[PDB]
């Protein structure tokens, strides 16, 4: 990671326990991204 990465939280805000998340990340070597809730599963809400 760079010292000051420009592309972070594009929409302003925060990530709670972000440093604890990075500490947990320093013991993980691989992720598998999976769709757990599809975006097409919101019929009564707007997703676009």
């Amino acid at each position: 990671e760079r010292a000051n990465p420009a592309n972070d939280l594009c929409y302003p805000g925060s990530l709670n326990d972000y440093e604890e998340l990075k500490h947990m990340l320093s013991r993980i070597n691989h992720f598998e991204k999976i769709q757990i809730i599809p975006k097409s599963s919101w019929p009564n809400h707007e997703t676009s």
Partner: protein, 48 residues
């Protein structure tokens, strides 16, 4: 022989005396969202 035995017992006694103030590990507990500080405690005690 008397001077030699006095010297070695003095050397041994100074070895014991200089090590009375070592580091004593104390058990401190942290929860699952305190893992960085838990690692800090583990590294401090193990380094000492």
């Amino acid at each position: 022989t008397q001077k030699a035995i006095d010297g070695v017992t003095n050397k041994v006694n100074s070895i014991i005396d200089k090590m009375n103030t070592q580091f004593e590990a104390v058990g401190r507990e942290f929860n699952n969202l305190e893992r960085r500080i838990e690692n800090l405690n583990k590294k401090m005690e193990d380094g000492f």
